[PDB]
Design brief:
Chain A: It comes from Caenorhabditis elegans. Chain A: Its main location: cytoplasm. Chain A: It is found in: Cytoplasm. The structure is cut from a larger assembly and holds chains A (about 400 residues) and B (about 150 residues). Chain A is of the alpha+beta class and about 400 residues long. Chain A has eight helices and 15 strands. In chain A, strands 1, 4, 5, 6, 7 and 8 form a six-stranded antiparallel beta sheet that branches. In chain A, strands 2-3-13-12-9-14 form a six-stranded antiparallel β-barrel. Chain B is α+β, with helices and mostly antiparallel strands. In chain B, β5 (about 130) and β6 form a beta hairpin. Chain B starts with 13 loop residues before the first strand and ends with a strand. The chains are: A alpha+beta (about 400), B alpha+beta (about 150). The chains hardly touch. Chain A binds eight RNA strands through β4, α3, β10, α5 and β11.
Amino acid sequence: SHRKFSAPRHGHMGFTPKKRSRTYRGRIKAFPKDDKSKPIHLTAFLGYKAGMTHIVRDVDKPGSKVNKKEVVEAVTIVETPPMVIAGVTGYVDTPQGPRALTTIWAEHLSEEARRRFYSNWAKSKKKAFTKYAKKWQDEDGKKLIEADFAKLKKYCSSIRVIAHTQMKILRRRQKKAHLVEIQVNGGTIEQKVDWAREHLEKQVQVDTVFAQDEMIDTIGVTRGHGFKGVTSRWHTKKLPRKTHKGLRKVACIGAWHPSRVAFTVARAGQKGFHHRTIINNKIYRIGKSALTEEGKNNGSTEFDLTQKTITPMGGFPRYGIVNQDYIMLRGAVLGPKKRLITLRKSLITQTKRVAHEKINLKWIDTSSKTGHGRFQTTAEKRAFMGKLKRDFLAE
Amino acid sequence: KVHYSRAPENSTKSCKARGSDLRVHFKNTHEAAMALRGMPLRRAQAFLNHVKEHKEIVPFRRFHGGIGRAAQTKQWNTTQGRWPVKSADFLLDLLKNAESNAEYKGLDVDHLVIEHINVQRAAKLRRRTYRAHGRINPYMSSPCHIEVILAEKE
RNA sequence: AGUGAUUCUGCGACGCUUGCCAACGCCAGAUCACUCUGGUUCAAUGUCGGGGCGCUAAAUCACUUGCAUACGACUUGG
RNA sequence: AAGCGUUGGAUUGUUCACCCACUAAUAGGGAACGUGAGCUGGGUUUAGACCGUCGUGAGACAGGUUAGUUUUACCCUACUG
RNA sequence: UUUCUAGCGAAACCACAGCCAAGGGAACGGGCUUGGCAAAAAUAGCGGGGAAAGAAGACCCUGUUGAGCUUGACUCUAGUUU
RNA sequence: ACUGGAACCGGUACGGACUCAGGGAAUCCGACUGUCUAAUUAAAACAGAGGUGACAGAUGGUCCUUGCGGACGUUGACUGUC
RNA sequence: GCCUCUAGUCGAUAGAAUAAUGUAGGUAAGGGAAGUCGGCAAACUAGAUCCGUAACUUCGGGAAAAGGAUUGGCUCCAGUG
RNA sequence: GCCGUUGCGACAAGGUCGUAACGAGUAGGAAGGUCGUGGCGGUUGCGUUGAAGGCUGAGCGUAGGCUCGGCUGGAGCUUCCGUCAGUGCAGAUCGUAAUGGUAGUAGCAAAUAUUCAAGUUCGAUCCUUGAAGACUGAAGUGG
RNA sequence: ACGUUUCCGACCCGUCUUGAAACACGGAUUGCGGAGUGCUUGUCUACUGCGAGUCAAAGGGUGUUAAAACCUUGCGGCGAA
RNA sequence: UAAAUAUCGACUCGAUUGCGAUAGCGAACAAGUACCGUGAGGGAAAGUUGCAAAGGACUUUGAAGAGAGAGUUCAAGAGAACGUGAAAUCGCUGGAGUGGAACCGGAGACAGUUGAU
């Protein structure tokens, strides 16, 4: 018999199976279509979700009720220190897809880049790339490397640079770097290979990959919640209070025939830690490293003259201090704080007005995110609260 | 009372030890003993002490219905193991007896290897358990016979 | 030196051979009539011994980390 | 052309029915009249009890009414991880 | 509590066993026919199926099988009246 | 020993925990207290006080016992049972 | 009811961890029965002093009807042999 | 071609042989059984130089079953002729005894709670001593 | 040959049933036990002895490898109308 | 008012085409016992070392059970729950197979077994 009253099914079946992501790092499943006319550029970057704040911005949106009016908007900070280009690889089309043709590594690879090849780096002899490094300063090795570069220039249809994050500058526990393959867009294959060769061992800043008021994509793994029931995993209706044997379940998990449980029914299992790709996150600001003169006050604006950095009072909770370049995206970003986010250039030809809208920040909230912060700076806090018993005893 | 399932290759440079109707769970002790196959005597004793200290796991290869998973299980190329302390104690006592037998026969104790080991089910002991609606069900213990043959390895 | 859908080609150089006539001229060849020999058929791999250049690593447990976690697993450090 | 939707309620155990309101629309159906080791137990459908009619009586009544125990998965498969 | 560990340790159930579509068949197959397919060993849940388990259907019918009760059924009888 | 009163004091509050009916307007049933299907029905079912009727003056009435004999009855109509 | 003294016990297989489902407790913004056969379950009320208390009634009740105010500590005053 | 049944026939035999045709089978009926089991009256033999019983290779028979070999075992067993029977099991939710998968699984969760040091011991969460922390709370976990 | 591998065939037995592999019932596994019998009375059939007869009963006599065997009937049963 | 007649309930005897420890009486044995029910009453299971205890002295590890040697013995693999010791079920060693059943009949091959005056 048909169900008495219609109702849409719970959940999106195209996001199943709800299983733990195969990898901790976000896999880039597609890259933006390559246009040969545009200048050579990278198509992706890596960062860490530091935390969230809110900002006040003047809105320029003709026809809207908030035109020429200030609005408060929540934003996410992603710390994106410069990435080191460690290798170049290329792909050749075959009747079964693109296939990696060869990979050329830089002569000198950072210790934190080589750590990624290890599970017990400290306990090992650290022999990775030791023989490869000697090829660059050898007659035959140089010939092989040049032949590989020629193969890349001659046969490949797409070029990717292997780039790795830098972890020592962050002054945090982890030292093992993250490696990723970023496709190079723009220019012909020969120009791409030459550009990668020049940039081998060199640092790339985020502002050379992304621009202001640009819509990007965030690829990563969402916050994990462990094993969860159907009510919290699929958002099914709770059963009446009088239910025997539990009410946080699905009453009927299938009809008599077919005499099997279908894959479309809600079942308890892992919730969270799923791979996701969210599109159309707008960039509200690209701030410089706070350790440089340009970034001394990367938390201030043209109309808020107080000299402050982006890091909130007391530091970013559970993350640390953002002392490197950062991107302020609008809205929420997948994963918890400290999660590694893969930022990717949009594959769409943006046409909506919100894609080209100019962002004019008037103020950035910096108060403490532990508790209810009343002040934007320690200087303001001390000025308001005057002098304390500690100071009096210090005198 | 229980004959050895095997005979030593050369009875001169070998010793034997036995135990019958031991009140230790047969399945647990059988898995623990099968974990000891081929080990040198000192390695076997160290392994049993590690099992007692939770530093090494006994892999449950046959009676693994409902057994949990652990990290130490990787070293045995399986996914289910445990730490049967009572079985470890009984096997340690048996190995001590075999060591004493080797000393008695005048063999180099530091070159002994476990040539043969076997565990067999013994006669069960009977107890009662009381169930709902005035019913009584058996509450049985499953003891084992344990036997070991050590041989001098060159 | 060329070939990218990774092996295969062209050019050499060097080795080992390879054709016909005198001419079955001359020697050798036979297992008795066939029963698995091409009258030792060919391939694939494993292992054990001698040599020729040639190299001198990692996982794992246990601690630790918490972005992860029913247990395994996952992310870190020595 | 079944891709996607086809609702909130009053009365009734009700499926149906009827009305109130909103709505893009308030379409019709199957899956052992889908779905009780998923629930509930209002009805039906034991034993207690009351009324009407019937029967000399015990008792009868898809006539009405009130109260009336809802057991077991640790196995195989399927499904979820 | 479940979960994992140390110790201890049952029971129900069990022809043989356990992936499906259609067909035909005792008219709703795990086995048969034609197809879809098909790769160890396992942990935690689950309640679609096993027309799952509990019980020689308490419903209905049959039996020249009963029993409780009733009476204007047949045949008797304690008691009582004469 | 309990009762009444006055000033002052604090703090989210004073029966500071604890202990202990939510209230009202009606309909149906049973008057009420009470009793009952131990292990699915606590009820409108039974009882009940009150009402009516029947029989019985003892050589009697109602019952039990195979019989002998016995109970109401240590009773006598304002009694006894139905 | 809660705490304590004399007296008596720590006997209920233990350890780690705190997933789902569960059993038993504690809360929940705005709305307030729209849930459901049905306000099932839960919440609400409550002690004491003063005031006030309807229909109906067998005049005995209804009645704690309904519904209001007060309540702590400290320093004092008065009354009651 | 071989096996057997039926009919016919030859042969001095309860037997052998020849010959032609034939060969489905539930319920059921007959026949043969040097198929098997346990007794009795007789007969033929074997056995501590290893009987019965038990495990299992070389064979025989269409089959029921049988013979021999090897190992275990330690005291009985057996041919054939008559005759007798408590004479052959896969089932009966069969009787009785034992044993599996489930399975090292369900589970050992009400009654607030234990900790430190020491003693004894081969061995102590659980026994004992001391210190601490809690509970029953006099209509008690008391007498 | 109850080992392995190939090609063909191959649904689980017993039972009631028109029809069972059945989503019909019994059957988890193994050992041992387990069901047309005794007797009385008929009838037919086969064999044996005698034959218008046959069998003889209870009983008696004898018998000591004495519950046996052997001997024994004016009369009794069946048959001869 | 004896005899011929009935009857193994009691006492004492002799036999058997009967059963051979799930059979035969319920009871081959501390059997109308253990145990169960308030009671009337119900009611089992349970035979076997060896000719002879000669029932394993002594050494050794362990707290001990127990084990390794040794000894007794025709024999202890007859060691006390002891004659024999089956099937189901189970563990080990070696070989071989192993894609959602497994088993099975027919026909080869392989491994293997066996015979050849």
